[PDB]
């Protein structure tokens, strides 16, 4: 029986999974998660999987900072006096969860100005029998960064907005293209999301 | 942005580095003086590495390459001005009576031999019964 290591939180849209490297030979795993001054909630008991879901706990309070640890129960059984374990990096979901790849909802050229709507993807954070939209969790902290260009020779002309809508003038000479990128400027890491699927008219 | 029927044409910023996508050469071809071209070129690829406020203490930023160069000011060591040390051990010679060890801008005081210092640093006191 050996301790786990390389514990990491693979989270996107608050879908948090804790994963560890060493393979379970004659060994099973169990993971507990708790806040700074909370109660150690145990999950994924005796499982041989090298990963465990933790979304249903961080969804309770995304703003708190969470600490987790993974024991290693010898296969067959408890331990002698204490299981052998290893902690995990402290994960505050609000400042760390990766933003999902945004999708463009619609785009229309009213007059000479285009109107690039952005679809609002939902997150794993729950409420009264419904998932919370991305805007419903971040609000003012969520801005966007559109890139538009001529189909040939690219030429990204960046633009910014604080809404799921856009209103930008064009030359009425060539079908522009769009690629949005949900940006949270109030973070320090994972600030910018991956670029949206390209959409052109 | 070396499109057809170009180069021999007069230079232009927008028509090259914004409409389409100009290269570095097409950059200087428009701006001549290299420094000013950098003034744009460090923005074109490396969007802006200091649009946040990483370097504290009102750290002005030039934002060149993606390495995020920032200007730090006096009274604060480090590039981000984050080191909040009082520049030396010279302040009251380390809040003391004689001097302070300058162990990499730390605060570790000492007195003279036979004049043992306190744990944190205060007036020197005789060590034995007849110092």
């Amino acid at each position, epitope marked *: 029986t050996v301790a786990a290591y390389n514990l990491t939180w693979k989270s996107t849209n608050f879908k948090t999974i804790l994963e560890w490297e060493p393979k379970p030979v004659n060994q099973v795993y169990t993971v507990q998660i708790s806040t700074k001054s909370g109660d150690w909630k145990s999950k994924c008991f005796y499982t041989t999987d090298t990963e465990c879901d933790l979304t249903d706990e961080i969804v309770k309070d995304v703003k708190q*900072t969470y600490l987790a640890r993974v024991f290693s129960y010898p296969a067959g059984n408890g331990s002698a006096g204490e299981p052998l374990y290893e902690n995990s990096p402290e994960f505050t979901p609000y400042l760390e969860t990766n933003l999902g790849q945004p999708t463009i909802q619609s785009f229309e050229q009213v007059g000479t100005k285009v109107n690039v709507t952005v679809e609002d993807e939902r997150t794993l954070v729950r409420r009264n029998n419904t998932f919370l939209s991305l805007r*419903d969790v971040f609000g*003012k902290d969520l801005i966007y960064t559109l890139y538009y260009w001529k189909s040939s020779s690219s030429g990204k002309k960046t633009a910014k907005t604080n809404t799921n809508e856009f209103l930008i003038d064009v030359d009425k000479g060539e079908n522009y293209c769009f690629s949005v990128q949900a940006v949270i400027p109030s973070r320090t890491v994972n600030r910018k999301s991956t670029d949206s699927p390209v959409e052109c008219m | 942005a070396n499109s057809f029927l170009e180069e021999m044409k007069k230079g232009h910023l927008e028509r090259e580095c914004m409409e389409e996508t100009c290269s570095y050469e097409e950059a200087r071809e428009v701006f001549e003086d290299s420094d000013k071209t950098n003034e744009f070129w460090n923005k074109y690829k490396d969007g802006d590495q200091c649009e*946040t406020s990483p370097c504290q203490n009102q750290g002005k930023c030039k934002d060149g390459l993606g390495e995020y160069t920032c200007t730090c000011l006096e009274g604060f060591e480090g590039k981000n001005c984050e080191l909040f040390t009082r520049k030396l051990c010279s302040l009251d010679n380390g809040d003391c009576d004689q001097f302070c060890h300058e162990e990499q801008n730390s605060v570790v005081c000492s007195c003279a031999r036979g004049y043992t210092l306190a744990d944190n640093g205060k007036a020197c006191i005789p060590t034995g019964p007849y110092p």
Partner: antibody
Amino acid sequence: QVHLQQSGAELMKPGASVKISCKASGYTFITYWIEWVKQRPGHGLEWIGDILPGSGSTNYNENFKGKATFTADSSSNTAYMQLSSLTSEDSAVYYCARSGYYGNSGFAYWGQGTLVTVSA
Amino acid sequence: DIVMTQSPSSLTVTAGEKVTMSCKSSQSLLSSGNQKNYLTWYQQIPGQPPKLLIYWASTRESGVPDRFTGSGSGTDFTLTINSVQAEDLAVYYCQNDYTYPLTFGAGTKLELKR
């Protein structure tokens, strides 16, 4: 529960600079916007600007550019606000606040309020 | 910048009936992405910090009594107090909670008619 213990009341001469503090307790300090609201009597409320601790991002009101500066040290879980070159217009009651939970949900928890007076 | 216009500067009411308030806004606060109106109400009894009343212009903060109620959409917003008690005597402030910079209203004094 939670509380925001601001500093005491001050009486500065004109041209001086006050340093209001606001200690946060009961919640995760680095994951909530710490606001600042100025309330001169007979003028209602007037948002000054906020800082997100840890990240350090700030959003100053334009009419308070230079006048108000927000710093934050997360080790002690207290914010700081500094008003420079005080005048008779700075004699007001300032507050700090903590943003709500589900995004742009107001200022859930307010400080007790700090009275600042400037006069010759 | 958004300007907010509390229509009653100072309204009086006998304790017991229903009151209604208005808080206009220059730019509409309705975000079309999720159909929420991002304005916050506040209650401030004099000498006390302003307790939050309603966020998103319709949702009661945990602890707010069940008589305060927000309504309206777009640019016109309304706060309703039913069966006014002696504790309701305060100045209420609406807030732009959509776009930086955040701007507060002019307030609305509440008086006990006699």
